[PDB]
Amino acid sequence: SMSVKKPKRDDSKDLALCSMILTEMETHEDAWPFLLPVNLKLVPGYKKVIKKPMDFSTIREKLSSGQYPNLETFALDVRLVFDNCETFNEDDSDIGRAGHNMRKYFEKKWTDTFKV
Ligand SMILES: Cc1ncccc1N[C@@H](C)c1ccc2c(c1)OCCCO2
């Protein structure tokens, strides 16, 4: 509270670490469904059903232009990619399985990088 400061983790490396994690995501074999925005003009239903589209290139642009206040807002956007994927894709489809795979991949890197 006022004049009662909580000790805080060193956040000075977060930008570099999130960029590294995103690079590993981008280069993953199963990243192809997520590298660019879904084309709202070519993919029926997507614009109406998915209220907040997100993809790796958009995340990369936001990371590069200071649009994430902290590492938690970065993780929200990454998870939003896979949440959208689950909404629109059957689990037993190529894109659906890709999403599950990339989510697992992300969360381990996230834990290993930032949880002690
Ligand atoms: C992640 C996601 N969720 C719902 C719909 C599409 C997508 N991914 C988009 C990028 C995509 C993937 C596969 C596609 C495609 C486009 O069209 C062009 C070629 C055919 O195959």
Closest by Cα among 87, 88, 106 to 31: 106
Rounded to the nearest whole angstrom, what is the distance from the C-alpha of residue 38 to the centroid of ligand 1? 6
CATH number at residue 16: 1.20.920.10
Ligand 1 pocket residue status of 40, Cβ below 6 Å: no
Domain that holds residue 54: 1-116
According to the entry, how was the structure determined?
X-ray
In sign, the C-alpha dihedral spanning 103, 109, 113, 116 is: positive
Report the 10 Å Cβ neighbour count for 83: 16
- Split into its structural domains, the chain has a count of 1
Instruction: List, in order, residues 6 or more apart from 59 with CB less than 8 Å away.
Output: 22, 74, 77, 78, 81
Rounded to the nearest whole angstrom, what is the distance from the C-alpha of residue 82 to the centroid of ligand 1? 13
Rounded to the nearest whole angstrom, what is the distance from the C-alpha of residue 33 to the centroid of ligand 1? 6
Q: Please report the resolution in angstroms.
A: 1.9
